[PDB]
């Protein structure tokens, strides 16, 4: 992957909000449905995502593009919705996530440019 102002601003201003809010502790990693007797889980969630995953991609630089990010967001949030009854805390906690993640996009440098600069070899 690479770096770009777009993916370094996920990763340090909106993963850095989301990680540590009071919400965040069911999205830090991968819904264990073993443990946790959800024997549907996978057969209604095609594309399990975690914040978890998420951070350890942006930390590896496997994103190419911000909005390959902004998907794994995006499906994290939209599992949580599709998955659970509609009046869990559980979705209120996805919600509330939801909202400072695209207030926090809201904020994003507007035009993705890689963050390079390069002398003119060869
Ligand atoms: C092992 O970690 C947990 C442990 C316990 C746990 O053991 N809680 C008990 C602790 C002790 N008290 C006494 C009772 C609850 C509860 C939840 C855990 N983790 C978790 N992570 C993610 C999800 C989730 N849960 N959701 C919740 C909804 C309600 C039941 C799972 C359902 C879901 F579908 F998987 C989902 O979408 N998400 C986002």
Same mark, same amino acid.
């Given at each position: 992957?690479? #770096?770009? =102002?777009?993916?370094?601003?996920?990763? @340090? #201003? #909106? +993963?850095? !909000?989301?990680? @540590?809010?009071?919400?965040?502790?069911? /999205?830090?990693?991968?819904?264990?449905?073993? @443990?946790?007797?959800?024997?549907?889980?996978?057969?209604?969630?095609?594309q399990?995502m975690? $914040?978890?995953?998420? *951070?350890?991609?942006?930390? &590896? &630089?496997?994103?190419?593009?911000?909005?390959?990010?902004?998907?794994?967001? =995006? %499906? $994290? /949030?939209?599992?949580?919705?599709?998955? =659970?009854?509609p %009046?869990?805390?559980?979705?209120? +906690? !996805?919600?509330?996530?939801?909202?400072?993640?695209?207030?926090?996009? !809201?904020? +994003?440098?507007?035009?993705?440019?890689?963050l #390079?600069v %390069?002398?003119? *070899? =060869?």
């Open positions: 992957g690479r #770096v770009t =102002n777009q993916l370094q601003y996920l990763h @340090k #201003v #909106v +993963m850095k !909000a989301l990680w @540590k809010h009071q919400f965040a502790w069911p /999205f830090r990693q991968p819904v264990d449905a073993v @443990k946790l007797g959800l024997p549907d889980y996978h057969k209604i969630i095609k399990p975690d $914040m978890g995953t998420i *951070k350890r991609r942006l930390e &590896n &630089n496997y994103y190419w593009a911000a909005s390959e990010c902004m998907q794994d967001f =995006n %499906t $994290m /949030f939209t599992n949580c919705y599709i998955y =659970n009854k %009046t869990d805390d559980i979705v209120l +906690m !996805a919600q509330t996530l939801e909202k400072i993640f695209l207030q926090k996009v !809201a904020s +994003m440098p507007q035009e993705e440019q890689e #390079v %390069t002398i003119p *070899k =060869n």
